[PDB]
Amino acid sequence: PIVQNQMVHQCISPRTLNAWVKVVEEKAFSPEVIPMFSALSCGATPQDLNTMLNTVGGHQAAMQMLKETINEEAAEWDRLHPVHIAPGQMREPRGSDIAGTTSTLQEQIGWMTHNPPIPVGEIYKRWIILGLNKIVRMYSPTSILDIRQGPKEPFRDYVDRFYKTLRAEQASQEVKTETLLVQNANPDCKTILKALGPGATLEEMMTACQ
């Protein structure tokens, strides 16, 4: 990554490398893996991001889908930012340079530490997260329509299952409580929730069915 000493390059740490490999091994593509990826790649160059992705051993269907998404975003970058070499001068990055495929570490450091900075690490991380979002959605095991409270299931446990599924499915903010959460509750809790009226908070609903 790039850190303050002046902005300088520092090697990716064994702690960082191991943390990422282990979270993928333990959590696969549960939604919380994405914020962990983003945090572990703080200040990362494109090289660092590729290291992190390349160190993953399993899940090669997912990694190939990610590669496709990256290539699509690279192509769209080039369409929106075409480029027309001067001795010792900084060249303009293409999509493949942002993805670390046709750029050197030194070029990446040059862009990231320029004034004004061209944040190729942040741009590439955006594309990677777009790809991971698609994978998380595809690998979500359950539709929100199929999360229904059991006859003997505590309301708290049902709500945990409901919002876990909703997070993975990644519907729009508008689509993403006053509707399906009540409809999918069990007969006894539904009767209680209906009586609360419109505009009840989640806290109030959970208290009511506790």
Q: Tell me the number of residues near another protein by CB under 8 A.
A: 30
Secondary structure (3-state) at 3: strand
Secondary structure (3-state) at 86: coil
Kindly state the smallest distance separating residue 86's Cβ from another protein, in Å.
26
The residue within the footprint of another protein, chosen from 17, 63, 65, 208 (CB under 8 A), is 63
Q: Cα–Cα distance between 113 and 52 in angstroms, integer?
A: 22
By CB under 8 A, tell whether 137 contacts another protein.
Answer: yes
The residue within the footprint of another protein, chosen from 19, 23, 28, 34 (CB under 8 A), is 34
Looking from the CA of 179 toward its CB, the CA atoms found within 13 Å total 5
The residue within the footprint of a copy of itself, chosen from 28, 101, 113, 163 (CB under 8 A), is 163
Please give the residues from 82 up to 111 whose contact with another protein meets the rule CB under 8 A: 99-101
* 58 closest CA partner among 83, 23, 91: 23
Q: What is the dihedral of CA 69, 124, 35, 162, to 10 degrees?
A: -30
Q: Which does 17 bind (CB under 5 to 8 A by kind): a copy of itself, another protein, none?
A: a copy of itself
Q: Cα–Cα distance between 201 and 36 in angstroms, integer?
A: 29
The residue within the footprint of a copy of itself, chosen from 28, 43, 129, 148 (CB under 8 A), is 43
* Pair 49, 15: CB distance under 8 Å: no
By CB under 8 A, tell whether 171 contacts a copy of itself.
Answer: no
For the chain, give the residues followed by a break (C–N over 2.5 Å).
5, 84, 176
**Cis-peptide into 116, omega within 30 deg:** yes
The residue behind tokens 């690279």 is 74
By CB under 8 A, tell whether 36 contacts a copy of itself.
Answer: yes
The footprint of a copy of itself (CB under 8 A) covers: 1, 3-5, 8-19, 27, 30-32, 35-36, 38-40, 42-43, 51, 54-61, 63-65, 68, 134, 138-139, 156, 159-160, 162-164, 166-167, 177, 201-203, 206-207, 210
The footprint of another protein (CB under 8 A) covers: 31-32, 34-35, 46-47, 49-50, 53-54, 63-64, 67, 70, 99-101, 129-130, 133-134, 136-137, 167-168, 170-173, 176
